[PDB]
Structure 1
Amino acid sequence: MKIKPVKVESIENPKRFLNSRLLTKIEVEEAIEKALKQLYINIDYFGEEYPTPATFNNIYKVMDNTEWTNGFWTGCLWLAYEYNQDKKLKNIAHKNVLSFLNRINNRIALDHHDLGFLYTPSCTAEYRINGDVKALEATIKAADKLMERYQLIINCLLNIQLLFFAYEQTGDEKYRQVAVNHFYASANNVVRDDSSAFHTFYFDPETGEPLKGVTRQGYSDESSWARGQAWGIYGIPLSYRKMKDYQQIILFKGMTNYFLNRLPEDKVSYWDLIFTDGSGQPRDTSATATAVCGIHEMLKYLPEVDPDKETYKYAMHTMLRSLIEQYSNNELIAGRPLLLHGVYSWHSGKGVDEGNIWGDYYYLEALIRFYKDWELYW
């Protein structure tokens, strides 16, 4: 078991992070309060239902438990609960959990590429918090559905955390091996030797026919999809928790340094990393929020003697500060997102320069991470 060698770029002009002011308790508190205000407003708006993956003119539409993104809404609720302990949040979120348990029992609109995202921030999340047996039941069942459908995209590094959890609850090594196998399979096949992320085959390897499930994400075969990069930056340290393989840290350094080096002047990624300032292209804030979470996670484990550790700390503070000051929602209206200016799917023209629910979740996760010693759902 070994990861292929990648180019680890040195961090270019580190002082553009190191000279930043660290976010204070007051700054993060207020960013949280502002997010939660919008969350409480959207609770009346959604009821027991869910937001759409992305907003339309910066307003979400209401939908049922049928997409790949529903767990992120419930995740936001559990994150808010971490903060204020408001039982209202735990009541509503648990009603999402029961809906998720119903979903996996009846196999409604289920795809194995998405089981991690749907059940970790919703159901595993509740189990972490209060040990609810229905939330455990739905998570284990979602993990068992993931095992048989394996019996390859960067996204999967996040998905396999569901398997690591299954192994910890059951003791069954078979969950762990699949997770380990798939981590290396993803690292060696969805990461380029220059540390950029790329995709699996978009076409059937037998016939060449167009595939249904996922179509197009980056700008081109030569580009660097920003969220794909971000999936790696967070997916790696999550797997590293369970694997303690030093090569994962090196892989993290490669993927993160690649990301940091292609950030514009305000340190918020464009939707693809070949774009920078003066391109007119939209930003992807959800990528930047995701990267902050990954960097924050890896810093728990990165040795004090790593020459880039302090730069990583200041980099994540810089990216988050910019997200708070320049990209967070100010308009207190029903249906508005927590975070503006993401892009869902550029090629299909879905959610371009719009708020998205994973972006809202990861921005809020980053705030909670900074503010408190947060026990991970993942």
Structure 2
Amino acid sequence: MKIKPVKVESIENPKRFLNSRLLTKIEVEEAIEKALKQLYINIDYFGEEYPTPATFNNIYKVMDNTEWTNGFWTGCLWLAYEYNQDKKLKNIAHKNVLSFLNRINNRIALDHHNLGFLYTPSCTAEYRINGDVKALEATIKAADKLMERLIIDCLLNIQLLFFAYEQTGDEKYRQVAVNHFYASANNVVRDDSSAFHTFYFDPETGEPLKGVTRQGYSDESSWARGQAWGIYGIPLSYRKMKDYQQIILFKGMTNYFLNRLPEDKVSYWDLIFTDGSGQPRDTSATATAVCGIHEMLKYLPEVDPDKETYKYAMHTMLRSLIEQYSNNELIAGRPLLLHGVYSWHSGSGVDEGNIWGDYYYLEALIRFYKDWELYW
């Protein structure tokens, strides 16, 4: 019930954020409209099926409901639906929900996949929006699967458990979520506020763990998306826990991230790289961090000397995403956002759009545009 001390860096050169122009309503509206043009085109391309995790030379392939990423496509549909109230979006996304209910009922391809990622933006999303009982059923069933049961994205995985607690009143859901927050905070964040890797090898035999992918350049580096899972997963958990130490841990992880952004404020795939490295960007890490900062700002005290800096930072990052990284070719299978990195070491989705990146980009847009009720 205590978070270990971490180093909180000062935000260096804060004027690089504070001198930016805030994103206007017209700017965000047009960014949304441009995204939805691509989404409506992709709707006829995927049908009742789903994009692959990442694009191939910037075009998604079509697949069934068997990856770790399928929920993020349904999430794009719900976000768009909240923008325009088009029942077509609702109809298609509810079909996805039905598919997710089937998938959890039959335990199809669940591996060790983050269940929050699969069920929150798809099923919990619909329950937020219209109270659909099947979406609720699918969500609780996934929470129960997670209960039977350390990576930093577990910070988003446990939001499923907080939802289950709220819906059931069963404190066991909450007890697990809270324990898992502190286990994650103390064991997968370094004392310098960098995120760190999970277990790659069996703790008894040293055997390579099955279905575990090396992320980040090295044991000594700072994987950008991992850092971002912290930046967003911490305030999400803070909503449900209200431990002020969580705000300090957020400032540590976020300042660490901001201080390693390059000139256009869009993270390289690993934070050890910046301008001149020749390394690919990971826009998805940046979109995720914008969402996390936006969320934390709902709670951060007015007297926090960095609050205004954070506000300008997320605007600076989102503006760069909209202006330099968002997709401009309205072609079947194109993503919302270019230049992400899925898995550098395995050579997958390197400098490709990815579906979680598209999701968090649209979520950031919707967050800025409206008072958005969280799926998480």
- Which range, TM-score by smaller chain? over 0.9
* CA deviation vs aligned residue, 1:147-181 (integer Å, no higher than 9, x gap): 001xx000100000000000000000000000000
Deviation at 1:343, TM superposition (A): 0.2
Deviation of the 1:42 alpha carbon: 0.1
Any unmatched runs of 5+ in structure 2? none
Deviations 1:327-348 (A, max 9, x none): 0000010000000000000000
SS at match of 1:353: strand
SS in 1 for 2:238: helix
CA distance in 2, matches of 1:74, 1:242: 25
Which residues of 2 match residues 126-205 of structure 1 at below 5 A?
126-149=126-149, 152-205=150-203
User: 1:194-251 CA distances to partner (integer Å, 9 max, x unpaired)?
Assistant: 0000012200001000111212001000000000000000000000000000000000
Distance, in Å, in 1 between the alignment partners of 2:174 and 2:249 is 21
SS of residue paired to 2:342:
strand
Stretch moving more, 109-118 or 271-280 = 109-118
Q: Is the 8 A contact 1:163 1:179 kept in 2?
A: yes
Cα distance in 2, alignment partners of residues 98 and 190 from structure 1:
35
Alpha-carbon separation, structure 1, partners of 2:213 and 2:305: 40
Q: Is the 1:112–1:146 Cα contact (8 Å) retained in structure 2?
A: no
Q: CA offset at residue 114 of structure 1?
A: 1.4
SS in 1 for 2:351: strand
Deviation for aligned residue 1:105: 0.3
Displacement of 1:314 after TM fit?
A: 0.1
Distance in 2 (alpha carbons) for counterparts of 1:108 and 1:69: 14
Deviation at 1:112, TM superposition (A): 4.2
Asked if the contact 1:113/1:155 (under 8 Å) is kept, the reply is no
Secondary structure at the counterpart of residue 328 of structure 2:
coil
Q: Runs of 4+ in structure 1 displaced over 4 angstroms?
A: none
Q: What is the percent sequence identity of the aligned residues?
A: 99
Once the two structures are TM-superposed, the CA of residue 302 in structure 1 deviates from its matched residue by 0.1
**What are structure 1's unaligned runs of at least 5 residues?**
none
Q: Calculate the TM-score normalised by the size of structure 1.
A: 0.99
Indicate if the aligned counterparts of 1:51 and 1:61 stay in contact, CA closer than 8 A: yes
Report deviation, 1:29. 0.1
More displaced 10-residue stretch of structure 1: 339-348 or 211-220: 211-220
TM-score, normalised by the number of residues in structure 2? 1.00
Contact 1:113–1:156 under 8 Å retained in 2:
no
| 1:254-309 deviation line (CA, Å, top 9, x unaligned) | 00000000000000000000000000000000000000000000000000000000
Deviations 1:71-94 (A, max 9, x none): 000000000000000000000000
Two-structure CA RMSD over aligned residues (Å): 0.5
Partner SS, residue 341 of structure 2 = strand
Cα distance in structure 2, aligned partners of 1:372 and 1:101: 29
CA positional deviation for 1:357: 0.0
Q: Using the alignment, how far apart are the partners of 2:112 and 2:209 within structure 1? A: 15
Aligned pair count reads 376
Measured after TM superposition, the shift of residue 111 of structure 1 is 3.0
Provide the secondary structure at the position in 2 that maps to 1:332. coil
* C-alpha deviation, 1:113, in angstroms: 3.9
Q: Which residue of 2 aligns with 1:9?
A: 9
**Contact 1:112–1:145 under 8 Å retained in 2:** no
- Aligned-partner Cα distance in 1 for 2:252–2:82: 32
- Report the 3-state secondary structure (helix = DSSP H, G, I; strand = E; otherwise coil) of the residue aligned with 1:374: coil
Question: What SS class does the counterpart of residue 48 from structure 1 fall into?
Answer: coil
Larger deviation: 170-179 or 106-115? 106-115
Distance in structure 2 (CA, Å) of the matches to 1:4 and 1:216: 26
